[PDB]
Amino acid sequence: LNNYLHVFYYSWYGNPQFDGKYIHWNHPVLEHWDPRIAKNYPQGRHNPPDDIGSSFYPELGSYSSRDPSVIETHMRQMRSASIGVLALSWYPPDVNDENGEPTDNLVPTILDKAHKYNLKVTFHIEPYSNRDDQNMYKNVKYIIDKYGNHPAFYRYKTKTGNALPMFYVYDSYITKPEKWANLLTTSGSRSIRNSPYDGLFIALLVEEKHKYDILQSGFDGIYTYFATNGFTYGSSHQNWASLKLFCDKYNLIFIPSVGPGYIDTSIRPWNTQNTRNRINGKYYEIGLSAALQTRPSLISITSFNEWHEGTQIEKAVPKRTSNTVYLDYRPHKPGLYLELTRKWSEKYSKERATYA
């Protein structure tokens, strides 16, 4: 199993059988700002189980994230792809994304199923409202306290030989660098350094200018997130060679993010310009290759199951309804992207042995 390969996991899906209502599968269609353009595009909410807010359709159907057999199936799928760590999208207690319900309750149940299958869980801290250094302190404390002692809880073994919690921080540039300094540098106001709530904090790099923002802040590494090649400076594959060199120069952990494709037109119908076709896994493989060539300490995959954005590697079946033809993995099997991940996971693990 590959402890140096991470996948972004989402636990925000609900259905009537396990939740009493659909959550996320019933997604609003997001109206365009200009009435002239919005007139022409679908409006309202998707009506599951047949009509979901995705271009693809899951083998497990419009599933609930809290269904224990679903979590188990997911774990087995990851296992079969040689992914060791799942980076769990996280919001604080009783907070959630705008189309979801709080998901911190699932964490104990997710950890259990992860350990059952010898997987590790790390945390992907979402931009919850009024996130700053203070409540970031509180929430890092929360995570390490509640979940730190669980056997599935992920720690990365440093060069020093000290195993530390990892935190991926999405949209980290929202908070000013000098506020992050309070949390992330040794002399900071509310510094987590050399305390029991220490960790490797990974900042999201969108733009070139952020290199210096991140340096100031005290972050331990950078990650690119976006599946779309060339959507941002960071998600452009060509800029990776450059970013690796920068991270090695200032002792940062560079974690590139690779995706199978992108299509979110089921919930943003104008946004065809950002669609990247999977071209039967060739786009995913060109991604992985580019990521491997940087000789990185870790690699991340966007995503396991972001169904809305069409970036999932989870199993997907062909499906057609009264007025939709879902995209599928044909001519290949439902497990294609898991099967491809495995091949590249193994190549990576054998190569990584020679730069450790």
Side-chain angles (χ1 to χ4, degrees), residues 1-208 210-321 323-356:
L1 256 178
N2 194 337
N3 291 291
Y4 315 112
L5 190 68
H6 298 199
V7 75
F8 295 111
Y9 188 77
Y10 298 86
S11 61
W12 61 20
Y13 302 98
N15 71 22
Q17 202 201 122
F18 299 87
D19 304 80
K21 47 215 172 287
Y22 283 111
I23 310 150
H24 269 270
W25 298 120
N26 71 329
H27 199 285
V29 186
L30 300 187
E31 282 191 34
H32 194 274
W33 52 90
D34 178 13
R36 300 197 283 104
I37 298 160
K39 228 101 233 176
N40 298 337
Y41 293 137
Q43 100 189 356
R45 277 180 181 265
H46 288 281
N47 262 146
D50 285 2
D51 175 35
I52 62 156
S54 181
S55 297
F56 292 86
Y57 198 82
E59 194 195 80
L60 299 162
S62 73
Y63 63 80
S64 173
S65 289
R66 68 182 289 130
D67 174 20
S69 82
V70 148
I71 313 162
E72 276 189 287
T73 306
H74 287 159
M75 297 306 168
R76 216 169 323 96
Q77 289 196 18
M78 291 186 244
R79 192 70 201 217
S80 101
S82 288
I83 300 159
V85 192
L86 62 145
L88 176 66
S89 155
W90 190 83
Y91 274 88
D94 301 309
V95 222
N96 39 259
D97 79 283
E98 253 215 75
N99 296 123
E101 299 210 320
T103 52
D104 187 66
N105 52 62
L106 275 168
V107 190
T109 319
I110 290 175
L111 274 160
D112 286 0
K113 305 293 163 162
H115 184 63
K116 208 213 172 143
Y117 280 70
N118 247 323
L119 301 185
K120 303 253 165 302
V121 189
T122 192
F123 295 74
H124 191 200
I125 316 300
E126 300 274 72
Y128 65 92
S129 277
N130 308 279
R131 186 178 73 188
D132 57 56
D133 54 291
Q134 195 151 212
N135 41 63
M136 269 294 274
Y137 183 110
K138 198 202 163 197
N139 289 311
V140 167
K141 213 175 84 140
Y142 184 75
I143 289 157
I144 279 154
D145 283 339
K146 244 212 184 208
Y147 316 118
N149 283 290
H150 190 281
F153 188 86
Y154 177 71
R155 287 178 163 93
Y156 173 73
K157 330 144 210 285
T158 44
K159 11 275 168 288
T160 33
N162 301 296
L164 280 174
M166 188 162 296
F167 301 95
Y168 290 87
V169 186
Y170 192 87
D171 272 354
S172 29
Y173 65 94
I174 283 182
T175 309
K176 297 272 310 128
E178 77 269 11
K179 305 266 190 169
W180 284 123
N182 297 315
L183 192 65
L184 299 173
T185 60
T186 336
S187 48
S189 275
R190 58 189 95 244
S191 175
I192 40 85
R193 298 299 173 204
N194 305 290
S195 76
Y197 315 114
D198 201 358
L200 306 146
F201 290 73
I202 316 303
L204 172 68
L205 189 143
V206 167
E207 282 175 330
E208 130 105 36
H210 290 128
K211 277 148 93 189
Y212 298 87
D213 273 34
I214 283 152
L215 255 178
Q216 195 45 93
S217 299
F219 283 103
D220 311 74
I222 68 156
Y223 83 108
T224 70
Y225 190 82
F226 304 99
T228 303
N229 183 352
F231 171 62
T232 60
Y233 177 97
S235 62
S236 315
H237 290 193
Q238 255 47 78
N239 283 326
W240 289 352
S242 184
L243 285 175
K244 179 54 177 187
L245 273 43
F246 176 96
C247 287
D248 282 358
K249 198 188 160 199
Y250 302 95
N251 256 63
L252 298 167
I253 302 154
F254 170 72
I255 313 161
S257 314
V258 177
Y262 191 94
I263 174 161
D264 75 344
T265 46
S266 68
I267 64 139
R268 276 175 206 89
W270 61 90
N271 192 29
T272 42
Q273 216 218 114
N274 274 248
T275 308
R276 267 69 185 152
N277 303 339
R278 298 196 167 200
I279 59 167
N280 305 317
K282 201 199 157 54
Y283 183 81
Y284 187 33
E285 289 197 82
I286 282 152
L288 298 153
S289 186
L292 233 104
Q293 291 268 115
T294 62
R295 294 181 146 238
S297 298
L298 305 172
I299 297 175
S300 58
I301 294 146
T302 297
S303 59
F304 181 73
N305 64 336
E306 230 289 9
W307 289 91
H308 311 309
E309 284 189 357
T311 66
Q312 80 296 327
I313 52 153
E314 198 193 326
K315 276 178 176 163
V317 284
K319 199 203 177 90
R320 323 177 278 173
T321 59
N323 52 2
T324 317
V325 173
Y326 290 88
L327 295 158
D328 52 54
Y329 302 158
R330 278 186 317 184
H332 306 280
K333 293 131 65 76
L336 171 68
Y337 291 82
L338 305 178
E339 210 195 332
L340 288 171
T341 301
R342 173 152 236 199
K343 166 212 178 148
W344 281 94
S345 192
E346 275 172 21
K347 197 183 269 89
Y348 179 48
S349 84
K350 172 145 45 70
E351 277 174 45
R352 201 199 181 263
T354 65
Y355 39 91

Coordinates of all heavy atoms in Angstrom, one line a residue, residues 310-351, unseen atoms left out:
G310 N -17.1 16.3 -11.8 CA -16.7 15.3 -12.7 C -15.3 14.9 -12.6 O -14.6 14.6 -13.6
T311 N -14.7 15.0 -11.4 CA -13.3 14.7 -11.2 C -13.0 13.4 -10.4 O -11.9 13.2 -9.9 CB -12.6 15.9 -10.4 OG1 -13.1 16.0 -9.1 CG2 -12.8 17.3 -11.2
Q312 N -14.1 12.6 -10.3 CA -14.1 11.4 -9.5 C -13.4 10.3 -10.1 O -13.4 10.1 -11.3 CB -15.5 11.0 -9.0 CG -16.3 10.2 -10.1 CD -16.6 11.0 -11.3 OE1 -16.8 12.3 -11.3 NE2 -16.7 10.4 -12.5
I313 N -12.7 9.4 -9.3 CA -12.1 8.2 -9.8 C -13.0 7.0 -9.4 O -12.7 5.9 -9.8 CB -10.6 8.0 -9.4 CG1 -10.4 8.2 -7.9 CG2 -9.7 9.0 -10.2 CD1 -9.2 7.5 -7.3
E314 N -13.9 7.3 -8.5 CA -14.9 6.2 -8.0 C -15.6 5.5 -9.2 O -15.8 6.1 -10.3 CB -15.9 6.9 -7.1 CG -16.7 5.9 -6.2 CD -17.9 6.4 -5.5 OE1 -17.9 7.6 -5.1 OE2 -18.9 5.6 -5.3
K315 N -16.1 4.3 -8.9 CA -16.7 3.5 -9.9 C -18.0 4.2 -10.5 O -18.8 4.7 -9.7 CB -17.0 2.1 -9.4 CG -15.8 1.1 -9.6 CD -16.2 -0.3 -9.0 CE -15.0 -1.2 -9.3 NZ -15.0 -2.5 -8.5
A316 N -18.1 4.2 -11.8 CA -19.2 4.8 -12.5 C -19.8 3.9 -13.6 O -19.1 3.4 -14.4 CB -18.8 6.1 -13.1
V317 N -21.1 3.7 -13.6 CA -21.8 2.8 -14.5 C -22.5 3.7 -15.7 O -22.7 4.9 -15.4 CB -22.9 2.0 -13.9 CG1 -22.3 0.8 -13.1 CG2 -23.9 2.8 -13.0
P318 N -22.8 3.1 -16.9 CA -23.6 3.8 -17.9 C -25.0 4.0 -17.4 O -25.5 3.0 -16.7 CB -23.6 2.8 -19.1 CG -22.5 1.8 -18.8 CD -22.4 1.7 -17.3
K319 N -25.6 5.1 -17.7 CA -26.9 5.4 -17.3 C -27.6 6.3 -18.2 O -27.0 7.3 -18.6 CB -27.1 5.8 -15.9 CG -28.5 5.6 -15.4 CD -28.9 6.5 -14.2 CE -30.4 6.2 -13.9 NZ -30.5 5.1 -12.9
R320 N -28.9 6.0 -18.5 CA -29.7 6.8 -19.4 C -31.1 6.9 -18.7 O -31.5 6.0 -18.1 CB -29.7 6.3 -20.8 CG -28.5 5.7 -21.3 CD -28.7 5.1 -22.7 NE -29.3 3.8 -22.7 CZ -29.8 3.2 -23.8 NH1 -29.7 3.8 -25.0 NH2 -30.3 2.0 -23.7
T321 N -31.7 8.1 -18.8 CA -33.0 8.3 -18.3 C -33.9 8.9 -19.4 O -33.6 8.9 -20.6 CB -33.1 9.2 -17.1 OG1 -32.5 10.5 -17.4 CG2 -32.4 8.6 -15.9
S322 N -35.1 9.5 -19.0 CA -36.1 10.0 -20.0 C -35.5 11.1 -20.8 O -36.0 11.3 -22.0 CB -37.3 10.5 -19.2
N323 N -34.5 11.9 -20.3 CA -33.9 13.0 -21.0 C -32.5 13.3 -20.7 O -32.0 14.4 -21.1 CB -34.8 14.3 -20.9 CG -35.1 14.6 -19.4 OD1 -34.6 13.9 -18.5 ND2 -35.9 15.6 -19.2
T324 N -31.8 12.3 -20.1 CA -30.3 12.4 -19.9 C -29.6 11.2 -20.4 O -30.1 10.0 -20.1 CB -30.0 12.7 -18.4 OG1 -30.8 13.7 -17.8 CG2 -28.5 13.1 -18.2
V325 N -28.4 11.4 -21.0 CA -27.5 10.3 -21.2 C -26.2 10.7 -20.4 O -25.5 11.6 -20.8 CB -27.1 10.1 -22.8 CG1 -26.0 9.2 -23.0 CG2 -28.4 9.6 -23.5
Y326 N -26.0 10.0 -19.3 CA -24.8 10.2 -18.5 C -23.6 9.8 -19.2 O -23.6 8.9 -20.1 CB -24.9 9.5 -17.1 CG -26.0 10.1 -16.2 CD1 -27.3 9.7 -16.3 CD2 -25.6 11.1 -15.3 CE1 -28.2 10.3 -15.4 CE2 -26.5 11.7 -14.4 CZ -27.9 11.2 -14.5 OH -28.8 11.8 -13.6
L327 N -22.4 10.5 -18.9 CA -21.1 10.0 -19.4 C -20.7 8.8 -18.6 O -21.1 8.7 -17.4 CB -20.1 11.1 -19.3 CG -20.2 12.4 -20.1 CD1 -19.5 13.5 -19.5 CD2 -19.8 12.3 -21.6
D328 N -20.0 7.9 -19.2 CA -19.5 6.7 -18.5 C -18.0 6.4 -18.9 O -17.3 7.2 -19.5 CB -20.4 5.5 -18.7 CG -20.7 5.2 -20.2 OD1 -19.7 5.1 -21.1 OD2 -21.9 5.1 -20.6
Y329 N -17.5 5.3 -18.4 CA -16.1 4.9 -18.6 C -15.9 3.9 -19.8 O -14.8 3.6 -20.1 CB -15.5 4.3 -17.3 CG -15.5 5.2 -16.1 CD1 -15.3 4.7 -14.8 CD2 -15.6 6.6 -16.2 CE1 -15.3 5.5 -13.7 CE2 -15.6 7.4 -15.1 CZ -15.5 6.9 -13.8 OH -15.5 7.7 -12.7
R330 N -17.0 3.6 -20.5 CA -17.0 2.8 -21.7 C -16.1 3.4 -22.8 O -16.2 4.6 -23.0 CB -18.4 2.4 -22.1 CG -19.0 1.2 -21.4 CD -20.3 0.8 -22.0 NE -21.1 1.9 -22.4 CZ -22.4 1.9 -22.8 NH1 -23.1 0.8 -23.0 NH2 -23.0 3.1 -23.1
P331 N -15.3 2.6 -23.5 CA -15.4 1.1 -23.6 C -14.8 0.3 -22.4 O -14.9 -0.9 -22.5 CB -14.6 0.8 -24.9 CG -14.0 2.1 -25.4 CD -14.2 3.2 -24.3
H332 N -14.2 0.9 -21.4 CA -13.7 0.2 -20.3 C -14.7 -0.1 -19.2 O -15.9 0.3 -19.3 CB -12.4 1.0 -19.7 CG -11.4 1.2 -20.8 ND1 -10.5 0.3 -21.2 CD2 -11.1 2.4 -21.5 CE1 -9.7 0.8 -22.1 NE2 -10.1 2.1 -22.3
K333 N -14.2 -0.8 -18.2 CA -15.1 -1.2 -17.0 C -15.3 0.0 -16.0 O -14.4 0.9 -16.0 CB -14.5 -2.4 -16.4 CG -14.5 -3.7 -17.2 CD -13.2 -4.5 -17.3 CE -12.7 -5.1 -16.0 NZ -13.5 -6.3 -15.7
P334 N -16.3 -0.1 -15.2 CA -16.5 0.8 -14.1 C -15.3 1.1 -13.2 O -15.2 2.2 -12.6 CB -17.6 0.1 -13.3 CG -18.4 -0.6 -14.3 CD -17.6 -0.7 -15.6
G335 N -14.4 0.2 -13.1 CA -13.2 0.4 -12.3 C -11.9 1.0 -12.9 O -10.9 0.9 -12.3
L336 N -12.1 1.5 -14.1 CA -10.9 2.0 -15.0 C -10.0 2.9 -14.2 O -8.7 2.7 -14.3 CB -11.4 2.6 -16.3 CG -10.3 3.3 -17.2 CD1 -9.3 2.3 -17.8 CD2 -10.9 4.1 -18.3
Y337 N -10.5 3.9 -13.6 CA -9.7 4.9 -13.0 C -9.0 4.4 -11.7 O -7.9 4.9 -11.4 CB -10.5 6.2 -12.8 CG -10.8 6.8 -14.2 CD1 -11.8 6.3 -15.0 CD2 -9.9 7.7 -14.7 CE1 -12.1 6.8 -16.3 CE2 -10.2 8.2 -16.0 CZ -11.2 7.7 -16.8 OH -11.4 8.2 -18.0
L338 N -9.6 3.5 -11.0 CA -9.0 2.7 -9.9 C -7.8 1.9 -10.4 O -6.8 1.8 -9.8 CB -10.0 1.9 -9.2 CG -11.3 2.5 -8.7 CD1 -12.1 1.5 -8.0 CD2 -11.0 3.6 -7.6
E339 N -8.1 1.2 -11.6 CA -7.1 0.3 -12.2 C -5.9 1.1 -12.7 O -4.8 0.6 -12.6 CB -7.8 -0.4 -13.3 CG -7.4 -1.8 -13.7 CD -7.9 -2.2 -15.1 OE1 -9.0 -1.8 -15.5 OE2 -7.2 -3.0 -15.7
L340 N -6.1 2.3 -13.2 CA -5.1 3.2 -13.7 C -4.3 3.8 -12.6 O -3.0 3.9 -12.7 CB -5.7 4.3 -14.6 CG -6.2 3.9 -16.0 CD1 -6.9 5.1 -16.6 CD2 -5.1 3.4 -16.9
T341 N -5.0 4.1 -11.5 CA -4.3 4.7 -10.3 C -3.3 3.7 -9.8 O -2.2 4.0 -9.5 CB -5.4 5.1 -9.3 OG1 -6.2 6.1 -9.8 CG2 -4.7 5.6 -8.0
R342 N -3.8 2.4 -9.6 CA -2.9 1.3 -9.2 C -1.6 1.2 -10.0 O -0.6 1.2 -9.3 CB -3.7 0.0 -9.2 CG -2.9 -1.2 -8.9 CD -3.7 -2.3 -8.3 NE -3.1 -2.7 -7.0 CZ -3.3 -3.9 -6.4 NH1 -4.1 -4.8 -6.9 NH2 -2.7 -4.2 -5.2
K343 N -1.7 1.2 -11.3 CA -0.5 1.1 -12.1 C 0.5 2.2 -11.9 O 1.7 1.9 -11.7 CB -0.9 1.1 -13.6 CG 0.2 1.4 -14.7 CD -0.3 2.1 -15.9 CE 0.9 2.3 -16.9 NZ 0.4 2.3 -18.3
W344 N 0.0 3.5 -11.7 CA 0.8 4.6 -11.5 C 1.3 4.8 -10.0 O 2.4 5.3 -9.8 CB 0.1 5.9 -12.0 CG 0.3 6.0 -13.5 CD1 -0.6 5.6 -14.4 CD2 1.4 6.6 -14.2 NE1 -0.1 5.9 -15.7 CE2 1.1 6.5 -15.6 CE3 2.6 7.2 -13.8 CZ2 2.0 6.9 -16.6 CZ3 3.5 7.6 -14.8 CH2 3.2 7.5 -16.2
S345 N 0.5 4.2 -9.1 CA 0.8 4.2 -7.7 C 2.0 3.3 -7.5 O 2.9 3.6 -6.7 CB -0.4 3.7 -6.9 OG -0.2 3.8 -5.5
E346 N 2.0 2.1 -8.2 CA 3.1 1.2 -8.1 C 4.4 1.7 -8.7 O 5.4 1.7 -8.1 CB 2.7 -0.2 -8.7 CG 2.0 -1.0 -7.6 CD 1.4 -2.3 -8.2 OE1 1.8 -2.8 -9.3 OE2 0.5 -2.9 -7.5
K347 N 4.3 2.3 -9.9 CA 5.4 3.0 -10.5 C 6.0 4.0 -9.6 O 7.3 4.0 -9.4 CB 5.1 3.6 -11.9 CG 6.3 3.9 -12.8 CD 6.0 4.6 -14.1 CE 5.8 3.6 -15.2 NZ 4.4 3.0 -15.4
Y348 N 5.2 4.9 -9.0 CA 5.6 5.9 -8.1 C 6.3 5.3 -6.8 O 7.3 5.9 -6.4 CB 4.4 6.8 -7.7 CG 4.7 7.9 -6.7 CD1 5.8 8.8 -6.8 CD2 3.8 8.1 -5.5 CE1 6.0 9.8 -5.9 CE2 4.1 9.1 -4.6 CZ 5.2 9.9 -4.8 OH 5.4 10.9 -3.9
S349 N 5.7 4.3 -6.3 CA 6.2 3.7 -5.0 C 7.6 3.1 -5.2 O 8.5 3.2 -4.3 CB 5.2 3.0 -4.2 OG 5.0 1.7 -4.6
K350 N 7.8 2.5 -6.4 CA 9.1 1.9 -6.7 C 10.2 2.9 -7.0 O 11.3 2.8 -6.6 CB 8.8 0.9 -7.9 CG 10.0 0.2 -8.6 CD 9.7 -1.2 -9.1 CE 8.3 -1.4 -9.8 NZ 8.2 -0.8 -11.1
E351 N 9.8 4.0 -7.7 CA 10.7 5.2 -8.0 C 11.0 6.0 -6.7 O 12.1 6.4 -6.5 CB 10.1 6.1 -9.1 CG 10.5 5.6 -10.5 CD 9.8 6.4 -11.6 OE1 9.8 7.6 -11.5 OE2 9.3 5.8 -12.5

